[PDB]
């Protein structure tokens, strides 16, 4: 009620307060509890191997220096008071570019408690690197992590734990990635040892499964239909040299046009992707089909037998190629 | 233990401290030891001729002004105390854009020692230029360097050395470039003389070898198959004017479509790349194949002999072209 009385209490807490010194300095390490409320996962970039995350990052710790008496309320102070208070040197190890929103003000919350408990909340948009194994692409499963660690203070000075156990991270179900689906999320607490010493570590990992629907319609179906369209040449009479030859290269031309567009949307990974194997395999089949007519024309100038053998073999071989390919990557 | 006693000690060190003056001012140059812990190499851009590097940059030096007694501990202070302490004017000569991460705070570490030793660590994401010799592209080897130098202080005032010898730089093995492989890294210490005087220099260089797997499948194989597909015209009977002519330009059309997509991913370098020579060479062969049928049709209206000579020569010449090309660039 008495604003002046509250003002005097806050000034008393800040008087002589040393931001440079952690709570319980020279004593037991301060336990910091962290909970994360995910707002959204804006982007997941395969070319840059990173994802953009927006979240409400909150930290809980006890500072006896900030304990106050006579005020049975939780003091929600202005965000500018955080500059006069000690906060953990929490940083993300795998982040590439992060910032705190400042509209209309810095999205920062300081909430004090009579016993000295401090609540520190930040709305952070971060871009964290995520190495992706694209061997099974686009049927791959990705495990993107978010590493949380103290920069300077070791385990002797500070400790990290998930506040609420497995409930420390919420809002996962609200995430709606156009290309991925959040299979599962895991919370890991561990200690990482460096040359300077051991540091506390908190890890938040998402298992992302890519949606196959877009690629099946966009990429696989045109490739299959062109390859089937190449088999039409076998039905065409052997004397129709102009027709069968024109069917050949145009199918080859069509396959190249499909191949040029598809490979652009991905980084240059030396290993063979599932999409890489399928596109090249189809391009070989149409290449062999035109070669098949070459042999037919040459021997003609048994010729029916070669065409008949080609007709039985090609759909069977392509079906066998599809069966082996799908089983390998599924 | 006594936070007030530690606070008084820190205030005593900062009292009368002059940030404008280096340690041992007017005396022997201050030796600064540097060690780098690489976090990741995010990007390597051929078009911009630069790479993005994230690392933990640490500096070691002795400042007798900051020596303290009676506290047998290493004081890990808040990162904001670095503004009140002298730090070397270390800058990167070849960098194009660099910044220090500030989430949740400035990724900066200050660690004092009783004898006056100061540890200054920074997590820096830097974009450093790297001139690339692309004559042997994509079978080229690149030597990208990171130049470390003092801006204002000469060798008379400051000196640089790698702390730990060849172990000063770590984390190289963890780097996973999708397009390159880290063959080797080297540490170089030298003095660079300018008009204003001689300055200490530290150089960190990476030898990058490009992965050839992506380009072999994406670019070379389609070009080879189209050229082989053009040789099919020789088997086709000479009277099939519509078939052989249609095979010719369509192969030429296919080669142009491949050429248009491939050259986009690279800067305009006047010299001939290995990929440049191969694409143009294949385009000449298909051009000659259609010219070959022109001569055949004209003389027909020996004609069999011209086709037979063409059949022997073309695969042999193309194989010879491939053999010379691969030996030159491997």
């Amino acid at each position, epitope marked *: 009620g008495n604003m002046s009385f509250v003002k005097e209490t806050v000034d008393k807490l800040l008087k002589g307060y040393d931001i440079r010194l952690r709570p319980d300095f020279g004593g037991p390490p301060v336990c910091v509890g962290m909970n994360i409320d995910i707002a959204s996962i804006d982007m997941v970039s395969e070319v840059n191997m990173d994802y953009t995350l927006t979240m409400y990052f909150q930290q809980y710790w006890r500072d006896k220096r900030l304990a106050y008496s006579g005020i049975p309320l939780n003091l929600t102070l202005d965000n500018r008071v955080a500059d006069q208070l000690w906060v953990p040197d929490t940083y993300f190890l795998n982040d590439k570019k992060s910032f705190v929103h400042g509209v209309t003000v810095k999205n920062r919350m300081i909430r004090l408690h009579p016993d000295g408990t401090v609540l520190y909340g930040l709305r952070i948009t971060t871009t964290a690197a995520c190495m992706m194994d694209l061997r099974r692409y686009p049927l791959d499963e990705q*495990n993107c992590t978010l590493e949380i660690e103290s920069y300077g203070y070791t385990t002797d000075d500070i400790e990290f734990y998930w506040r609420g156990g497995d409930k420390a991270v919420t809002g996962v179900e609200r995430i709606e990635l156009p290309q991925f689906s959040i299979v599962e999320h895991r919370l890991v607490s561990r200690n990482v040892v460096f040359a300077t010493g051991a540091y506390p570590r908190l890890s938040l990992s998402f298992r992302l499964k890519r949606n196959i629907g877009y690629f099946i319609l966009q990429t696989y179906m045109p490739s299959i239909l062109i390859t089937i369209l190449s088999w039409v040449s076998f039905w065409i009479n052997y004397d129709a040299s102009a027709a069968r030859v024109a069917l050949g290269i145009t199918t080859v031309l069509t396959m190249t046009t499909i191949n040029t567009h598809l490979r652009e949307t991905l980084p240059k990974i030396p290993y063979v992707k599932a999409i890489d194997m399928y596109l090249m395999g189809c391009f070989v089949f149409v290449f062999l089909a035109l070669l098949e007519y070459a042999f037919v024309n040459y021997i003609f100038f048994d010729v029916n037998a070669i065409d008949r053998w080609s007709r039985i073999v090609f759909p069977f071989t392509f079906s066998l190629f599809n069966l082996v390919y799908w089983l390998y990557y599924v | 233990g006594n936070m007030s006693f530690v606070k008084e000690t820190v205030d005593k060190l900062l009292k009368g401290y002059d940030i404008r003056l280096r340690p041992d001012f007017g005396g022997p140059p201050v030796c600064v030891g540097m060690n780098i812990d690489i976090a990741s190499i995010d990007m390597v851009s051929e078009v911009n001729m630069d790479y993005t590097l994230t690392m933990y940059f640490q500096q070691y030096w002795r400042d007798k002004r900051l020596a303290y007694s009676g506290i047998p501990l290493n004081l890990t202070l808040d990162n904001r105390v670095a503004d009140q302490l002298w730090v070397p004017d270390t800058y990167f000569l070849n960098d194009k854009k660099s910044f220090v991460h500030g989430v949740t705070v400035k990724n900066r570490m200050i660690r004092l020692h009783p004898d006056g030793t100061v540890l200054y660590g920074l997590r820096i994401t830097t974009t450093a230029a790297c001139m690339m010799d692309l004559r042997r592209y994509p079978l080229d080897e690149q030597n990208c360097t990171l130049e470390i130098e003092s801006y204002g202080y000469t060798t008379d005032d400051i000196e640089f050395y790698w702390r730990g010898g060849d172990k000063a730089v770590t984390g190289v093995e963890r780097i*996973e470039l999708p397009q390159f492989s880290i063959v080797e890294h080297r540490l170089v210490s030298r003095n660079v003389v300018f008009a204003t005087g001689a300055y200490p220099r530290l150089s960190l260089s990476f030898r990058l070898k490009r992965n050839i797997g992506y380009f072999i499948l994406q670019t070379y194989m389609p070009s080879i198959l189209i050229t082989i597909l053009s040789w099919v015209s020789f088997w086709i009977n000479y009277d099939a004017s519509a078939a052989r002519v249609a095979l010719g330009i369509t192969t030429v059309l296919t080669m142009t479509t491949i050429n248009t997509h491939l050259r986009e991913t690279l800067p305009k370098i006047p010299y001939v790349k290995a990929i440049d020579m191969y694409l143009m060479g294949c385009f000449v062969f298909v051009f000659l194949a259609l010219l070959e049928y022109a001569f055949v049709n004209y003389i027909f209206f020996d004609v069999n002999a011209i086709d037979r000579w063409s059949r022997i020569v073309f695969p042999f010449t193309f194989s010879l072209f491939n053999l010379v090309y691969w030996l030159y660039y491997v």
Partner: nanobody
Amino acid sequence: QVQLVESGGGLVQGSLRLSCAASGHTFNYPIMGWFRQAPGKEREFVGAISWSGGSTSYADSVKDRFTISRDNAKNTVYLEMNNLKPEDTAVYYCAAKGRYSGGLYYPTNYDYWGQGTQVTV
């Protein structure tokens, strides 16, 4: 989950090649390190290699004598030991390290460990 099995370590007085087979989500643990634990002593670092890339790191005691190589297709890490010395009598272990597990020299940072082969020379 990663399962590590190491083999190829016998009793000799010499060049030896130790192979460590891996199975599971090996991509999430791209760094493989070799550790030996002499009786009455703490487990000692030998050499740590990455599954991808192939860059190497070795301890000073075994530098230029032990060489390690790996191949992702085989999913196996091969440790080649040459010029054996009597101090090399320890149980050799194969361990996998997460990408963000910190320092290589500390066995605590490694999550999955092999059974351990007893080699006496």
